[PDB]
């Protein structure tokens, strides 16, 4: 059908969109970030799934949660946690900005 999610905001806030390429081992990962003031979302085009995660409270880094995943960036690095395959959260996939 539509092929787009359109989220109508209630004010005239600036919306920015930015695609960042990551390398996760031997694999490529495209993440698109959507920022509109308080709102920060990340679309991750994973091999097994397309996920949209929302930025959530963290002490350090920029942490996004969506579906079974946590995507947590810090500087040029990132960890992708899978809470179904790895509920102990000690074996995330490690990624770096390309």
């Amino acid at each position: 059908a539509m092929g787009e999610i359109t989220i109508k905001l209630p004010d005239s806030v600036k919306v920015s969109t930015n695609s960042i390429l990551y390398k996760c081992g031997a694999k490529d990962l495209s993440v698109t970030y959507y920022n509109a003031g308080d709102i920060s979302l990340a679309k991750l085009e994973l091999e097994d799934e397309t996920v949209v995660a929302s930025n959530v409270i963290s002490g350090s880094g920029a942490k996004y949660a969506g579906s079974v995943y946590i995507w947590w960036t810090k500087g040029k690095t990132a960890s992708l946690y899978n809470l179904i395959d790895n509920p102990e959260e000690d074996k995330p996939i490690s990624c770096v900005e390309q």
């Binding site: 930015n18 960042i20 920022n35 880094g61 960036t73 900005e97």
Partner: peptide
Amino acid sequence: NYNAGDRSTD
């Protein structure tokens, strides 16, 4: 440390 994703810094 700058986080390009949400434009925050640690």
